[PDB]
């Protein structure tokens, strides 16, 4: 874990999700509301501007509900990315956010990578604010995790 201030809170939150993913995925499937309410996410929530925390949470919880209803747990990187923004008490709105800001305002883009959140499909590792957060499991049938074939030449 990192210790530098707000940046560390962000890095460590995603590290925690990755380290606990095999539990988190099951809670997200079976009892997501409970998952969203874990005190684990309180520090992250404090990085989200107070005036918009609730709106972001309404957006992400709704998106997750719609996601889960039609797709289930397919999208690991996206579930991990958005999960901490579900932590605040939700305030529902009709606003569709393309990005979500944290105070470190830096933007996490909803689709795809950003300076803040950068998943690489070749190494299968997540990078947050230029720091390693760990290895993601996109395919739950995979035995070997991490870097793809044909990366190291020899």
Residue numbers in the entry: 537 to 640, 644 to 693
The authors write:
Each segment is packaged in a ribonucleoprotein complex (RNP) together with the nucleoprotein (NP) and the three subunits (PA, PB1 and PB2) of the trimeric RNA-dependent RNA polymerase, which mediates viral transcription and replication in the host cell nucleus. The PB2 residue at position 627, which in nearly all human and avian influenza strains is either a lysine or glutamate respectively, is the best characterised polymerase determinant of host range and virulence. Here we extend the structure-based exploration of host determinant residues through the identification by random construct screening of a new PB2 domain (residues 538–693) that contains position 627 and is thus denoted the 627-domain. The 156 amino acid 627-domain is located between the cap-binding and NLS-domains and contains six of the seventeen host species determining sites described within the PB2 subunit: N567D/E, I588A/V, T613V/A, K627E, T661A, T674A/S where for each position the consensus human and then avian residues are given.
